[PDB]
Amino acid sequence: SKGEELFTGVVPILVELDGDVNGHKFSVSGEGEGDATYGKLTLKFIVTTGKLPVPWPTLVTTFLQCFARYPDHMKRHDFFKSAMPEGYVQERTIFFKDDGNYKTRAEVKFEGDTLVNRIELKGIDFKEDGNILGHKLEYNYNSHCVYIVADKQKNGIKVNFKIRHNIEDGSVQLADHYQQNTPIGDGPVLLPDNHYLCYQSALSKDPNEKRDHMVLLEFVTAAGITHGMHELYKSGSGMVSQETIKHVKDLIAENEIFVASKTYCPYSHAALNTLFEKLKVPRSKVLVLQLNDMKEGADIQAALYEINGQRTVPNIYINGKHIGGNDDLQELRETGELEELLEPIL
């Protein structure tokens, strides 16, 4: 399958990392599973070479954003899954305030029914007495959202975020991240509009594990883009004769309630149900118009736009005053404005 289809269910994950921080070589292996529908991640890492020369917490970001949950209205912005199965390369440079930095490169891709994260990390200029080499960071992780931005030039995404690692003495170790993601193959990929990815992580130990390890649980969700559906409702694609313009105006002035609609339009359905059922308004007070059922439907609707700028049905009016669409009608229903507008009419 292609792109997101590959993440519909629970996916097995494998992670491999070879690192050398300040000359101290080490390598870790990790396994778990992802469930993008719930933005779930469950992994277990084990150090193969002995122990870790750095705190586990400082490796969390390095140790799978293709598993984040993207809401139904943000599928077009899921860059990570669109790169699969071929994958993408993730590069980062993490500057540790008043200390050394990590430079990382990783290739994420499917190898069979498995998503594999192969990483290479190098650390340099770290203080042997600092919080990193000195192992002074609490075994926890803070929650927060990061700002995701597309990099049209590189055909991928960019991210600059800061991680705060709690230090045992109540203070904090600053981890300034610089992330760059690039597609591996040359097939289509979805570049997103700026948005957010909110993380929540949980670190634990396997009481049955005797080698240095870490059990990570991450919950990730995409957020920040607006639900385009009701927006589209408002948006819509020779000028009309004044003859028609006045006529529509007359229709507006000569009627207590005016409603231009179409028989198949949901918003019209609801606007009408609101007036005739919910608010039990008399059919003799409401002049309805099924534009898709008239000779001059087009002309009328055209004339309407010319008169109020609205291009979509339902186009509602009350006592000569333009109201708008259904959302405008619901607007006034809640603020209680509608009830008072109808009082006189009723």
CA atoms of 58 and 337, how far apart (whole Å) = 56
2 phi and psi, to 5 degrees?
-125, 150
As a whole number of angstroms, the distance between CA 104 and CA 109 comes to 16
Look-up of token digits 């400082």: 58
Residue 339's contacts (CB-CB under 8 Å, 6 or more residues apart) are: 279, 333
Which residues make up each annotated binding site?
262-267, 301, 313, 326-327
**Secondary structure (H, E, C), 134-164:** CCCECCCCCCEEEEEEEECCCCEEEEEEEEE
**Paired strand residues for 175:** 96, 163
CATH class of 1-225: mainly beta
Token pair, residue 228, equals: 């385009």
Query: d(Cα 3, Cα 170) in Å, to the nearest integer?
Result: 44
End-to-end CA distance of the chain: 60
Binding annotation for glutathione: 262-267, 301, 313, 326-327
Q: Where are the domains of the chain?
A: 1-225, 226-346
Q: Which residues contact residue 118 at a Cβ distance below 8 angstroms, ignoring those fewer than 6 apart?
A: 15, 16, 17, 106, 107, 108
Residue 141 exposed, middle or buried by CB count within 10 Å (0-12, 13-18, 19+): buried
How many Å apart are CA 94 and CA 148, to the nearest integer? 17
Residue that has been written with the tokens 């209680």 in this structure = 336
Give the amino acid at 3.
G
> Which helix (DSSP H) or strand (DSSP E) does residue 15 occupy?
strand 11-21
Experimental method: X-ray
Look at domain 226-346 and name its CATH class: alpha beta
List, in order, residues 6 or more apart from 109 with CB less than 8 Å away. Answer: 84, 85, 86, 87, 88, 115, 116, 184
Find out whether 275 and 258 touch, Cβ atoms under 8 Å. Answer: no
Bridge partner list, 157: 150, 181
Beta carbons of 273 and 329 less than 8 angstroms apart: no
> Please, which residues bridge with residue 149 across strands?
158
Between CA 67 and CA 78 the distance in angstroms is: 10
Question: Which of 161-195 are b and which e, b meaning 16 or more Cβ less than 10 Å from the residue's Cβ?
Answer: bebebbeeeeebbebebebbbbbbeeeebbbbeeb
Distance of CA 76 to the CA centre of its chain: 9
Helix residue spans in 194-321 (DSSP H): 228-234, 242-253, 266-273, 297-308
Resolution (A): 2.7
